[PDB]
Amino acid sequence: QIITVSVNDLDSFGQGVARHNGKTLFIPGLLPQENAEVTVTEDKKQYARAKVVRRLSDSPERETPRCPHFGVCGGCQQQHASVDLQQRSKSAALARLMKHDVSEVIADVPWGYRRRARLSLNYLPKTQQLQMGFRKAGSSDIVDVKQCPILAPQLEALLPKVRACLGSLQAMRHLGHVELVQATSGTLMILRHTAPLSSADREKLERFSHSEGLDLYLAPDSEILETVSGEMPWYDSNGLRLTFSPRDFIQVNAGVNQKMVARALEWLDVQPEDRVLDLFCGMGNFTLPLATQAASVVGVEGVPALVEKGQQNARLNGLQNVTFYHENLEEDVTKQPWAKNGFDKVLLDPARAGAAGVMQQIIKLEPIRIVYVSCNPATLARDSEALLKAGYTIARLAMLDMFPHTGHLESMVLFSR
Numbered sequence: 001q002i003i004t005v006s007v008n009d010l011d012s013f014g015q016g017v018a019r020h021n022g023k024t025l026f027i028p029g030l031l032p033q034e035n036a037e038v039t040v041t042e043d044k045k046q047y048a049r050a051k052v053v054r055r056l057s058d059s060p061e062r063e064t065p066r067c068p069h070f071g072v073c074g075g076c077q078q079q080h081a082s083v084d085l086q087q088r089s090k091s092a093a094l095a096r097l098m099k100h101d102v103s104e105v106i107a108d109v110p111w112g113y114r115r116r117a118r119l120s121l122n123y124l125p126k127t128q129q130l131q132m133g134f135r136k137a138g139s140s141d142i143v144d145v146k147q148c149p150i151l152a153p154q155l156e157a158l159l160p161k162v163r164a165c166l167g168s169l170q171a172m173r174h175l176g177h178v179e180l181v182q183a184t185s186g187t188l189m190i191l192r193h194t195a196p197l198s199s200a201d202r203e204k205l206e207r208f209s210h211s212e213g214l215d216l217y218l219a220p221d222s223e224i225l226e227t228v229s230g231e232m233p234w235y236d237s238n239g240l241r242l243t244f245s246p247r248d249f250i251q252v253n254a255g256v257n258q259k260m261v262a263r264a265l266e267w268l269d270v271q272p273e274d275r276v277l278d279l280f281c282g283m284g285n286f287t288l289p290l291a292t293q294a295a296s297v298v299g300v301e302g303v304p305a306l307v308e309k310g311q312q313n314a315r316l317n318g319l320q321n322v323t324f325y326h327e328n329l330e331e332d333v334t335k336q337p338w339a340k341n342g343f344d345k346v347l348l349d350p351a352r353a354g355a356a357g358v359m360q361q362i363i364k365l366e367p368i369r370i371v372y373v374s375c376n377p378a379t380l381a382r383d384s385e386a387l388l389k390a391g392y393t394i395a396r397l398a399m400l401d402m403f404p405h406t407g408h409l410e411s412m413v414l415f416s417r
């Protein structure tokens with residue numbers, strides 16, 4: 001009960017890392033080189049946890065959190081760390097894993113950067129209140145969100161007005177969640193609800209969205225999406241106009257995404273005669289901009305709805321030299337007819353698990369350059385080993401600061417011969 005410690009390190013996840021009596025201590029709210037009186041409620045084998053009771057000193061990289069919900073909301077972990085410190089700590093971890101220096105950090109605005117949010121809704125029958133916000137750290141309980149400085153300003157401004165509108169509904173107790181999305185075309189609101197809405201409630205929602213200039217969609221279940229108002233949304237990115245369905249996945253950080261795509265294109269050094277392969281291509285985030293430079297592009301993706309949107313967006317942007325295939329990237333696809341003309345360049349952006357079975361497949365293809373975008377540096381590091389064994393070197397490595405103030409650690413690597 002009560003001991004004095006010094007924090008050595010700031011981990012990926014935003015807790016300070018210290019040692020006491022030779023055991024690792026994880027302390028939330030404490031930064032590298034700060035000292036503190038602390039208490040452990042949680043003592044285990046390989047490590048222990050503790051809370052700050054009194055912080056004795058301050059790092060020069062310490063900032064004042066901009067959000068009043070920070071420390072309680074599960075959404076942010078590191079608002080107390082300056083952006084330089086966040087970037088330095090993540091870059092250091094990445095460099096250590098890859099055994100290679102970080103060439104650059106790709107970043108944009110540290111605040112106001114999220115172009116979509118899903119707000120959970122929960123009804124409290126004992127007090128007849130509606131909660132609207134995000135999950136708490138290590139709990140399913142909702143923090144009522146009144147401000148969210150990471151959210152795009154158009155969306156942040158809507159928070160109290162959405163709250164008062166939903167709080168006015170008869171159907172308040174039967175609401176699931178509400179998604180707010182900002183796109184070049186307009187602002188979108190999607191309300192997921194659990195039973196039929198009355199006409200008085202539909203009218204409130206209609207008048208509200210109509211007053212605020214929002215496109216409104218209602219989702220009575222997991223498949224149905226009714227357009228109350230709006231035309232097909234779209235956003236502009238990297239020289240293209242890209243339509244999307246309000247359910248479909250679009251990137252959270254628009255600015256960092258556009259910079260990532262632009263950089264990946266510079267790294268691939270795409271030539272007019274190049275044939276390019278884009279694995280895990282989604283609806284063509286990288287694929288469509290690659291087609292503006294290359295002789296031809298193939299995208300491969302496992303969701304058919306994304307393959308069809310990629311095709312639609314190619315046509316809309318006058319891209320005749322790109323083909324999208326639906327494939328299962330867990331199986332062997334060097335077999336396929338689209339492989340045989342071969343590839344000069346390959347880009348892949350998989351999920352957390354990585355592309356393990358895929359690395360040998362890429363190697364068989366013998367591209368002169370490969371760009372790999374990862375959200376899990378551990379799997380990136382394992383997959384890199386296979387490319388290094390087959391004669392590729394690390395030409396460039398970047399830390400992508402896609403989710404400021406969180407524990408995410410995204411990265412991008414250029415391999416070449």
Ligand code: SF4
Pocket residue numbers: 067068069070071073074075076134145147148149150151
């Ligand atoms: S900025 Fe938003 S996500 Fe981050 S702690 Fe505040 S409410 Fe949660």
Ligand SMILES: [Cl-]
Pocket residue numbers: 192219222247
């Ligand atoms: Cl939905």
Ligand code: NI
Pocket residue numbers: 177179190192
């Ligand atoms: Ni939803």
Ligand code: NI
Pocket residue numbers: 100394395
């Ligand atoms: Ni090097």
